[PDB]
Structure 1
Amino acid sequence: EETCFDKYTGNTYRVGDTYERPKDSMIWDCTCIGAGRGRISCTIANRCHEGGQSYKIGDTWRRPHETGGYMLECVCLGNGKGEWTCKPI
């Protein structure tokens, strides 16, 4: 059967199956390409993470303030860069 194996995760994938693979202190979105011995194709994911947990594009993680004593509220904007915006109260 057409399946690709990623030694990083340890689970095989059928053709057209995408998964998550941690590459160099990062999370990669990988897909399995058929034909041959199951070629593995991996490309970075269009998301924003770091700090403590992962964050999606346009997502929010309104949590306390790192440099303040009040609940901080921040957002994440993609646009192929990885920017964020917060407005504490």
Structure 2
Amino acid sequence: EKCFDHAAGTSYVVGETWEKPYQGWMMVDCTCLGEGSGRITCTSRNRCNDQDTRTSYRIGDTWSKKDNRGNLLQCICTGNGRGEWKCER
């Protein structure tokens, strides 16, 4: 029983996970459920998809960007089970 990633031309068995692009630059992790419909479930809970930089980060990745007043922030992806990161002056 397979799930298919038609964008990547690939297929998976029940229980397998893989990385898949979402709307151009974001990344999600998808798991094959199958259920006789090739059902997959995807989530970015373990990634940081920062709309501000249109870049997808992994837990532990660090990056910098401005706040709204000229200060450079340093950010780190923590995940926290919810796609979370922290930035600090």
Do both proteins adopt the same fold according to a TM-score greater than 0.5, normalized to the shorter chain? yes
Aligned to 2:58, what secondary structure does the other structure show?
coil
The equivalent residue for 2:12 is 13
Point out the structure with the larger strand share. 2
**Alpha-carbon distance in structure 2 between the residues aligned to 1:56 and 1:8:** 22
- Give the distance between the partners of 2:61 and 2:30, measured in 1 at CA: 25
2:77 aligned partner: 76
Instruction: Report the secondary structure of 1:55's partner residue.
Output: strand
Judged with a 3 Å threshold, the aligned counterparts in structure 2 of structure 1 residues 23 and 73 are, in CA distance, closer, same or farther, namely closer
Asked if 1:27 corresponds to 2:18, the answer is no
The amino acid across from 1:78 in the alignment is: G
Instruction: Determine the structure 2 residue equivalent to 1:56.
Output: 58
Largest Rg, 1 or 2: 1
% of aligned pairs identical?
35
| Equivalent residues, number | 81
Shift of 1:48: 0.5
CA distance in 2, matches of 1:33, 1:84: 32
Identify the structure with bigger relative contact order (alpha carbons < 8 Å, sequence gap 6+): 2
Instruction: In structure 1, give the amino acid aligned to 2:17.
Output: T
Cα RMSD of the aligned pairs, angstroms, is 2.8
Structure 1 segments unaligned to the other structure (5+ residues) = none
